């Protein structure tokens, strides 16, 4: 419910980026697991480990180091830090000034 | 399912429907004010799964919680004016009601 | 290090432009992303690199302070390197570029390598009596129709010919097996004839991994003799190589290990129990698997050798083809899956290909592997491209829709009405509306409507499940009113009313449980409930109650 | 002056030039009242009479030998009403001049 | 059509015609903005303009 | 009700206590019946 997938009007859902980021991390995590089951040549599993690391690193703090992954809107999608940190995180607006 | 615009809406007396015509949409020229219904629209509620003692109060007075709840277009509060025109855009698949 | 005095310049000015941070850069930076990262590192410690003259009259220092020297260290180091260690894609491109893309008919060579690598394991299988006994048991098992006869083979090297060459296997196996110095030639020739077969995949897989399980039980008892004595009893490693290694079944290497009367030997009395019992284990296990230990030991050892040879060449095969894989994947790039997802799914398909190859078909490996890889890549793009997983045939329908829509847009003048697509396609015209409302992607709840506050979309979504505080404060009043009404009733009728619904208790009860509570039939209870209801229906107990029915 | 800037477009020496001949502004489907009522952008179709000429790769300097002709549809262009305003989705809009 | 339609339909130089008035329309048509794509923003300018 | 708030690292153990079961697949809803 903190990262919902609310149904807007017209069968056009609205979600927060965190679902996209969690998809991106779970996909590469599962793919790494299957690579480790297949006993792949360590070149591909190395690339998979690095991909999973970038996924987790963009889930934790997107835009921190590696040119943040952009969502489907062209846009650098938010991560847990951006829901916390900055002018727009929790600590600033809804944590100080509310309706 | 669909949503209707019929002039029969649950949980409102006939006194609040002297404005709506049979087809559900207000008469052109009627003087409405806040809280009146400009359009009578209901959406299906399935299903309620009601409470304790509310169940007893239902049994006592033999009523039935309606399968529908109403989401009808009422004048925003404060407004007070004359309905001067009403258009009815209908999707192509649907069939026009009486007012359209 | 002009960078280092660039930092001091940006400080002693209190700000840096893009002009200065383009002047005092390294002259050898070609990858712009390095410029990105370093200007970020600069701003992280101060000072912020705006693009012009300002900060002229803006005298506002959040850049303190431990970050300053660390970031200066990182900047002074960025010249010591050249990058990049920040793009996985480019590091993978380099990684595959390491392997020379020259396997020009060396493929067939390494493929024959794979073939005669996975047949040393074939022989080590052929020397494993337990797997071959399983094959015999399942011959007599499937020919008795305990499974489909194809449960043994994915093709072979005739039903009655199959079963009767299995019969000759049975006869050669008995002459192999009851001839306990006669077993040598019989078993070896039967393995020669046996190596002309072609198992079911799962059959061979299970039988060989249970071969591994057998040798690993032997290996576990080896542990039980090793760490219990050499590493725990402080048995001499040279001793463990001397006495135990070589005999392994007799009692002359451990029971003649305490008995060797040494500082090491007569300390074996405390871990003597589990070695005593492990000898029993291994001595019965010799017959349990069907042969004394060392034989099947080194047969599965050569098995390991052969499998290692097989795998180590499939590596070179896979890399030489992934050089192609990247290229083949590049034509699926915008389809919803970022690039390195595509090439990783491709490489999974590529391993699939290399483990299903044949030089016998005389063609070029490229076409076979590229079929595999395009199939698996489009499988990926289908199965993990959207936030709501829509099936693949549905994606086919959507693609048809997009193509025919673009076509009607430029053939039928203005645009395609879905009533018109209902004819242009052979679909039922609500399938079309459905598939159109199903193919759309979700709006991001943080997409900002460009208003004053810069509030996004996810802050204008009411919560249509909560109950309005007026409604909860009503039914609390309803609990009050109903309890009041019941209070003015006989205890029989009141308890029956409560127990009948769930009023201010746990679960409501059927009439029979109620009669249980009062020792009555359910008809008595229905009478009580009906009388209480009739009593309550009248006003003076029902005015406020019926007013709760606001209508 | 936006068609000449890109026409004629030749192949990469391909002896085939797609050249522009003229264009024309279609008739608007809806006039501005109906365009506001329906929520449409009041505009006009834009027909363009391109022409594919081909030369076979012999001589001399691309012999024009196998040419075509058509009327293509490249997009609809919104129209300024008699008071200098557009109807973009039924809403009146105005394009404010920029100072660059 | 997509490019020109996103110009006309969504960009800082395509605004609701203020119409509460005859003068409001006639002075919103004759307006010379200094913003938008191809023109400086509010932060970057700034008392130059 | 409460008092000071502690922040710190979280072991994998503490994280497994926080959860109510592991998430294995990357799918969200069922696209036709949106359960
Ligand atoms: C406010 C925001 C920026 C303004 C440009 C615009 C840009 C795209 C608009 C949405 C799309 O139309 C799709 C969808 C159609 C539904 O039927 C009604 C809701 C949706 C989500 C719309 C609401 C809103 O209008 C959006 C978010
Ligand atoms: C006021 C604001 C305009 C500011 C310029 C417009 C632009 C986007 C609009 C929302 C979206 O349409 C999505 C959604 C559609 C529902 O059906 C009705 C609710 C929602 C949340 C809308 C409320 C409102 O209408 C919004 C905030």
UniProtKB/TrEMBL annotation, chain C:
Pfam families: Sigma70_ner, Sigma70_r1_1, Sigma70_r1_2, Sigma70_r2, Sigma70_r3, Sigma70_r4. A motif (Interaction with polymerase core subunit RpoC) lies at residues 341-344. One of its GO terms (biological process) is DNA-templated transcription initiation. InterPro entries: RNA_pol_sigma-70_dom, RNA_pol_sigma70, RNA_pol_sigma70_r1_2, RNA_pol_sigma70_r2, RNA_pol_sigma70_r3, RNA_pol_sigma70_r4, RNA_pol_sigma_70_non-ess, RNA_pol_sigma_70_r1_1. GO terms for cellular component: cytoplasm. GO terms for molecular function: DNA binding; metal ion binding; sigma factor activity. Keywords: Cytoplasm, DNA-binding, Metal-binding, Sigma factor, Transcription, Transcription regulation. Residues 341-354, 510-536 form the RNA polymerase sigma-70 domain. Its main location: cytoplasm. Residues 396-472 are annotated as: Sigma-70 factor domain-3. It comes from the Bacteria. It is found in: Cytoplasm. Residues 317-387 are annotated as: Sigma-70 factor domain-2. The keyword DNA-binding applies. Residues 485-538 are annotated as: Sigma-70 factor domain-4. The keyword Methyltransferase does not apply. Residues 511-530 bind DNA. Mg(2+) binds at residues 543, 546. Interacts transiently with the RNA polymerase catalytic core. Sigma factors are initiation factors that promote the attachment of RNA polymerase to specific initiation sites and are then released. This sigma factor is the primary sigma factor during exponential growth. Belongs to the sigma-70 factor family. RpoD/SigA subfamily. This is RNA polymerase sigma factor RpoD. The gene is rpoD.
